[PDB]
Amino acid sequence: RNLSALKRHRQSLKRRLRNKAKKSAIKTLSKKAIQLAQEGKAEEALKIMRKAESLIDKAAKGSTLHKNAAARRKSRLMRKVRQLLEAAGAPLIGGGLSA
């Protein structure tokens, strides 16, 4: 009575579980960086932003995020981090912002 598209559903869940866990991280660190960036903490802000960037791009290589999506987040993150920082900041140990 049963087809084997069930294996596909099995695949489904595990993969879902997988990249689900990756997107959380990305959102967390991103938030974490911008939170610090506004708080004036240049160094740790940038430090976390770098980690985020890595996690985003790492998501891009597989079927989780992908391409412009990752490209996009990074820009929004960097765009946000830099702006908030020039609230008397100066980028310490310039993390991931060519400047």
- Cα–Cα dist 36/65, whole Å: 25
Choose between 4 and 88: whose C-beta lies nearer to RNA: 4
Question: Is 95 a binder of RNA (CB under 7 A)?
Answer: yes
Choose between 15 and 40: whose C-beta lies nearer to RNA: 15
**Considering only residues 24, 69, 86, 87, which one is a binding residue for RNA as defined by CB under 7 A?**
69
Q: What is the DSSP string of 29-48?
A: HHHHHHHHHHTT-HHHHHHH
Q: In angstroms, what is the C-alpha Rg of the chain? A: 17
Question: Is 54 a binder of RNA (CB under 7 A)?
Answer: yes
Q: List b or e across 80-92, with b for residues whose CB sees 16 or more CB atoms inside 10 angstroms.
A: bbbebbeeebebe
Question: Is 31 a binder of RNA (CB under 7 A)?
Answer: no
Question: Is 76 a binder of RNA (CB under 7 A)?
Answer: yes
Residues that bind RNA (CB under 7 A): 1-16, 18-20, 50, 53-54, 56-58, 60-76, 78-80, 82, 94-99
